[PDB]
Design a binder for this molecule. Sequence first.
Ligand SMILES: Nc1ncnc2c1ncn2[C@@H]1O[C@H](COP(=O)(O)OP(=O)(O)O)[C@@H](O)[C@H]1O
Ligand SMILES: Nc1ncnc2c1ncn2[C@@H]1O[C@H](COP(=O)(O)OP(=O)(O)O)[C@@H](O)[C@H]1O
Ligand SMILES: [Mg+2]
Ligand SMILES: [Mg+2]
Lengths: 398, 402
Amino acid sequence: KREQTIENLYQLAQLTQQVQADRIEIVLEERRDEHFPPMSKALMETRSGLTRRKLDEAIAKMEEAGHQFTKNNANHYSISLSEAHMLMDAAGVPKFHERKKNNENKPWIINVQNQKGGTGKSMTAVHLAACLALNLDKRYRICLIDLDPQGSLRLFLNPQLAEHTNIYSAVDIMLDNVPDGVQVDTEFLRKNVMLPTQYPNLKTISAFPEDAMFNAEAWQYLQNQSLDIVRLLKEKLIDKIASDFDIIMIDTGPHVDPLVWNAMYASNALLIPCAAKRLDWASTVNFFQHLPTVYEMFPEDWKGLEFVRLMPTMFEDDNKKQVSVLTEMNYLLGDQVMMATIPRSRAFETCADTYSTVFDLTVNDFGKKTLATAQDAVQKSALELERVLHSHWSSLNQ
Amino acid sequence: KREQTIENLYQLAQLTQQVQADRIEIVLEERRDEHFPPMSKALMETRSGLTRRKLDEAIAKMEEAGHQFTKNNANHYSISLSEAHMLMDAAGVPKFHERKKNNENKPWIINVQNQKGGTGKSMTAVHLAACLALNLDKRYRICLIDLDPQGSLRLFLNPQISLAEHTNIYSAVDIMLDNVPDGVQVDTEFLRKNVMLPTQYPNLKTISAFPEDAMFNAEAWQYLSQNQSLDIVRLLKEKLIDKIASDFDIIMIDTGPHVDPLVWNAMYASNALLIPCAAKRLDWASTVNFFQHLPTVYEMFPEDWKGLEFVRLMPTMFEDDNKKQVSVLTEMNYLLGDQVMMATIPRSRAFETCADTYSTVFDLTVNDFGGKKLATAQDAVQKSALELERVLHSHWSSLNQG
Ligand SMILES: Nc1ncnc2c1ncn2[C@@H]1O[C@H](COP(=O)(O)OP(=O)(O)O)[C@@H](O)[C@H]1O
Ligand SMILES: Nc1ncnc2c1ncn2[C@@H]1O[C@H](COP(=O)(O)OP(=O)(O)O)[C@@H](O)[C@H]1O
Ligand SMILES: [Mg+2]
Ligand SMILES: [Mg+2]
């Protein structure tokens, strides 16, 4: 009877093989067509350590080259992000990475990981990446790798004609899922992987559900006792891209797989976001218990993890239970927990509903101050993270 | 170098070993907080298949006894769910297993599975379970096993209704890994009192899931590497399903978006396969890749495996007026017809309200909006459930022998 069933499933596979997924078509149907909110002169001045005189001089220098800015009959300006990066390049700012002693720097590889789903992990990741990409004084080179096959990071930072076609994911690069005749060159990685977003300096390596096969073709393969699978992501992707980025951030998902193991091995920093709820905190501490027993099995040439941080998410701040849970986090493993939380606001629910960040939204989408406070909270969290990255940076170069 | 990091991690885990997870406290904080919407003679007839005369005679018999019914603002009676279950055995119609026409049935082990998340398989599972439980005439003994560590099937107003006098509450993964007190043995009574919990549907029991269960995969990752045995797929069927089949007509396993050794357990234990897939394009393509991968996995299973008996693709979130989605649905029906189910599930706002309120379309009323939309949604769910029931009654005697 087993024969009949296996025959029937093989028949289903043969009947349905004819349909394949066109990734370009999927990305095209998921086009952004929303136009990132343009910045006024003051918003430009706050996102970029620039005085009004320097900004006016930059506008003059760029206008002398023919480029025409967008202002209204009362000289209110609507500066796009591209114009904002050009104003920095046209202002003489050394643009962090091009200046001294930081010119020779080992890039940060941050792994956002937790065993519980429904804690703002995937959302904290995109918000952190965007908010760091909005520091126009430094203009960090940021890469966001969606390592969750069920991830939607390709929808929040939508990648981009029909002559730079066929986009491969991280897993695809791990399995050499490429034309048999192509090289693993960095220009290839720059061209049809690591696609640009509505932010000029922030690239995303998108994920697709078909990536899940990696685990299936590795769970059965684990009969071979390899325990070298963890080297795949770092040896096949990161080392080929680390020359181009200052910060790489990896969004994994709520599980423990060979893929999440790759994310752990390639990482040199670990970020653990967890909601201030009792169930989420208990699952996170079970994750804590589990983490070292697996990290030991990693090969000796690991030497990873410069620092580890717990990021409280969805903090209600009026709920006695949630504040008590946060105080427990602070008492048990303090200073390893972050001092900047991310609140529960209707703003982030709107973000999830519209597949965008609070920085892609406008004040007229719902709630006036309720968006300003959300953006300021995300900025405080990103600033604390930046302070931690700068503190532990020289220790990362060796 | 990394020695200091691993010592730091061990100190992180030691600093926090004190905080445990009280799975009784969290199910009590998740109490139902409301009752099932009572039925008013009409729903009773439609669900029970009873004539108005027989129903009235039975309720008048029950009223002359110590029991008294209850009406609403209008004198029409407003009977609850358990009151209707009592009406059933107090009307003459036996339970499904009580009917001597089939008393040695191998129960259905239906496995809902697809390596694409967000295609609405969990909602399909909970609604199928609730609707089949609402067949008051036959009163199937149904068990909904949440095998998704991130599953919330206990939440969907399927509350593990249990008085505060019950010691613990274990998941299916806990029973598989023998994660119970040391002295006790896993008998049908232990599973009955600590594993399968009441749901507010008298004929439906639920096995809960918790995020900690995720670590099962680790318990296999080192098993599969240092040992090429593949005997972990037997854990679900042998440690739980076999010791539990004596109490259920139907068992539905909700799995999760992955293909894992836990999903392997769900596949090995199943005798029926449901593949819900949304009418979206990339959903259909990922389900097709899943199809391509499936037989190469099932072929690795041990030689003691009595097949699958049937497979059904369940379209979900169908938008009815979307040209791309209707094209995809017609492609699904054309390529593997007779194996794709006819009744689909719309993209109704009623299911959005369900996901917002953690309920089923049979639990909430018209006031939660709409109105006609909920009626059409629950009618569609009932139609799909009747189709699956007709399929089950067909292929049943095929596996009653094996
Ligand atoms: N800061 C926040 N405030 C309010 N709601 C949030 C916040 N972050 C996340 N959410 C909600 O919780 C859900 C968690 O999303 P996600 O981060 O993808 O979870 P996970 O990372 O566990 O998959 C989202 O759908 C969103 O609606
Ligand atoms: N018919 C429907 N109409 C509207 N929304 C739906 C419908 N069916 C499912 N959904 C939405 O899709 C989501 C699917 O959730 P879930 O079933 O847990 O994912 P998975 O299918 O991966 O298990 C739900 O949150 C629900 O809000
Ligand atoms: Mg996520
Ligand atoms: Mg699910």
